[PDB]
């Protein structure tokens, strides 16, 4: 393994999990890639993918309006709080869940999927027998060390995003829309995006649960080359620790250098 990852995590006082795959050559880079970390808001992109697979755009399903109540609003609901009166279409909830990380939007997608259990069943349907979602927003962010609830691994998370964005799990309109939402993410500018060459196209989904956790998963296209899928998950030993965005960016640049 490349010694940069051990130095990165030791200096940052964090446990660092990395998995990246060049989908053209199949070369990989892995550090703690099979260890569990919180999945947290990285579930939101997968939940959109699950709904897109269960209800293709051509059915009209994404045009229906969900009339969620004000009582269902949880902490950090930047879009959904502004639309309680009118409701939001499923497509708008997906946009909010991915690009703004809206927590009520995430719960609304979970409801349509049959809750955390139905979402986890979708992960199994991708061949992911490791990741699991157990709770709703915002309890799923507790990130207690050792607790397997609401966890993934760098390798499993990368595989799932690869299958939905690069691979052929979804139909073509659904794959394109999921890709567009990830590329339009607004929450990731200091994480994986900050470690990549400026010219690469990037779509990503972040999360920042407790225990100083900084998570990001991305698909990136170097100019005219096959995409690279990158998962970088980090967490710390103290509940109230500070997430380290620059750790995610630095691990990403290390991946670029190795691949």
Automatic annotation (TrEMBL):
Reactions mediated catalytically: a beta-lactam + H2O = a substituted beta-amino acid
Coiled coil: none
All copies of domain Beta-lactamase class A catalytic, residue ranges: 18-233
Highest taxon in the source lineage: Bacteria
Similarity comment: Belongs to the class-A beta-lactamase family.
UniProt xrefs under PANTHER family: BETA-LACTAMASE (PTHR35333), BETA-LACTAMASE-TYPE TRANSPEPTIDASE FOLD CONTAINING PROTEIN (PTHR35333:SF3)
Official protein name in the record: Beta-lactamase
